[PDB]
Structure 1
Amino acid sequence: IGTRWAVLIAGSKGYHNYRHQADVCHMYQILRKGGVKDENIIVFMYDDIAYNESNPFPGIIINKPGGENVYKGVPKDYTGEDINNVNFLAAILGNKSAIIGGSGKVLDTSPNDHIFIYYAXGAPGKIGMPSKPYLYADDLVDTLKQKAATGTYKSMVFYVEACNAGSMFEGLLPEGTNIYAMAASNSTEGSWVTYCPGTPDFPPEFDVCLGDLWSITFLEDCDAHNLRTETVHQQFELVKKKIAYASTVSQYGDIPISKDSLSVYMGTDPANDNR
């Protein structure tokens, strides 16, 4: 019962920030393969990578060496300077009349729907937007409190790839409104980039990192398993263990929500039914 929705947002701009847009495009491919529909996936990506004069492969974005083109077919709801706090927060709330610029696609969800939000690109108490102002912890949590008050969702999972990512939720995110959050790092740690030049077996055409460590770890995990048999809690434990040497994967909010299979939010790719 209900519909799966998602909001994917890369909070940065500039070719050196290739990884944030590659991470978000990779998440789109997982949702598309799982049967989540484009009308229910709101994408915020600056869109300055695929056709950049510096990109050695125009029209292509990869999130791993030798990987597939993750840019192919990704919707463009909010690009360029339309990625900002006003539009990101109105999209989460689901109020089309509060969007200023962009497609107007928002989470106009119903009570049995599921929501998955993934943000990639931070400092204590804030995460980036392509231009100032940045998004502050209190303002993001206040929007989540407004969304909970409307009652227009069954449960929500929010994944954040950023430095000090846990600072967006620590001591603020409510625990009884069906919102579970997972962060690449805790409130006082930075997060790591990965797939950078100068590593064994790396495409010689690139001078930028292709992904972020926590992101490619959870994204590649989604690609390799039947999401009906892996829960959010099992992914938390697996990814937390895998990257313990770099940062402390952290969880906040309504922890029992993580008993849900990942397919509740992402669907599942029939090619991995045996895995």
Structure 2
Amino acid sequence: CTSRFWFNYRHVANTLSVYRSVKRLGIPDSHIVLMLADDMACNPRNPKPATVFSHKNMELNVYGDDVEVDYRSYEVTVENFLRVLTGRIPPSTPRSKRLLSDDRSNILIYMTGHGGNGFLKFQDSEEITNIELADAFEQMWQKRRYNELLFIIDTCQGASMYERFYSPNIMALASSQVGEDSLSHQPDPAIGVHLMDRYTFYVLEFLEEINPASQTNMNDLFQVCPKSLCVSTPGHRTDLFQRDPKN
């Protein structure tokens, strides 16, 4: 989550919804490198401390009682992110703050925040571009640090963040296409700021209905958000995956 300032509560909620689904489906905390550029979970402005909500009904706290943030506040930088992906972190970094993936590792990477054309703003200050992201993914593939990689981005014009990928096994999702930038705004009266980005909200709803022993496939998640529901057109990308998404 590359966003601060408590009015970007939607981005923290996106990240924590993906985190809740992933941790419910099996991935341990040690294998999740969670980054929240601001808590917005129990900062003083929160009307409900220690909770992050997905819906106005306030019945599903994506910031549950079992959550670990490996990188938070000023630690969540484009530098630190690329360090985690490429493995070039400082040597004192612990296990929990690094991606110790191998050739047999499936990696899910979910990026959320303000994002323009082929670039993602990190805490309103710095920038990660699709060129740098593709280069980092290639560097990961050179060392065989992932078996298959699923990239999901939930920013504006997010289909261009995965437009410069060349590493062999990556399939990518995106909330919006190259052009659409209209950013939704419907602040909850109870929680002052916006709740979600409406794309990961339906991804969360899609992922809430499956169990760990579920046979749902990527083809059932390639149409989780239709044009009727999220104003933007969520575009995927399978030009690299060898395996058929339906399997």
Whether TM-score is above 0.5 comes out as: yes
Give, in whole Å, the separation in 2 of the partners of 1:141 and 1:79: 24
8 Å Cα contact 2:14-2:201 kept in structure 1: yes
3-state SS of the aligned residue for 1:87?
helix
Q: CA deviation at 1:246?
A: 0.9
Q: What residue number does 2:220 align with?
A: 234
Q: CA deviation at 1:102?
A: 8.8
Q: CA deviation at 1:149?
A: 0.9
Q: What residue number does 1:125 align with?
A: 118
What is the identity percentage for the equivalent residue pairs of Structure 1 and Structure 2? 26
8 Å Cα contact 1:50-1:60 kept in structure 2: yes
Structure 2, unmatched stretches of 5+, are: none
What letter is aligned with 1:15?
Answer: W
* Cα deviations by residue, 1:174-204 (Å, 9 ceiling, x for unpaired): 2x6111111111111126436x23xxxx6x4
The reply to whether residue 178 of structure 1 matches residue 164 of structure 2 is no
Stretch of structure 1 that moved more, 144-153 or 185-194 = 185-194
Q: What residue number does 2:159 align with?
A: 166
What letter is aligned with 1:232?
Answer: M
Give, in whole Å, the separation in 1 of the partners of 2:67 and 2:24: 12
* Cα deviations by residue, 1:96-147 (Å, 9 ceiling, x for unpaired): 4378x89862211111111001111111121120142111111111101111
* Cα deviations by residue, 1:209-238 (Å, 9 ceiling, x for unpaired): 100011111111111234632212221123
Give, in whole Å, the separation in 1 of the partners of 2:124 and 2:48: 27
Q: 1:257 to 1:219 in 2, by over 3 A?
A: farther
3-state SS of the aligned residue for 1:118?
strand
* 2:59 aligned residue (53, 58, 67): 67
* 2:47 aligned residue (38, 56, 63): 56
Q: CA deviation at 1:46?
A: 2.2
Q: 1:160 to 1:249 in 2, by over 3 A?
A: same
The reply to whether residue 22 of structure 1 matches residue 13 of structure 2 is yes
Q: 1:28 to 1:214 in 2, by over 3 A?
A: same
Give, in whole Å, the separation in 1 of the partners of 2:95 and 2:101: 17
Q: What residue number does 2:232 align with?
A: 247
Give, in whole Å, the separation in 2 of the partners of 1:140 and 1:90: 11
* 1:223 aligned residue (208, 232, 236): 208
Q: 1:242 to 1:91 in 2, by over 3 A?
A: farther
TM-score normalised according to structure 2 size: 0.88
Q: CA deviation at 1:13?
A: 0.5
Q: What residue number does 2:180 align with?
A: 189
What letter is aligned with 1:75?
Answer: E
3-state SS of the aligned residue for 1:205?
coil
What letter is aligned with 2:109?
Answer: I
Q: What residue number does 2:102 align with?
A: 110
Count of aligned positions: 242
3-state SS of the aligned residue for 1:143?
helix
The reply to whether residue 211 of structure 1 matches residue 202 of structure 2 is no
TM-score normalised according to structure 1 size: 0.80
Within-5 A mapping of 1:149-160:
149-160=142-153
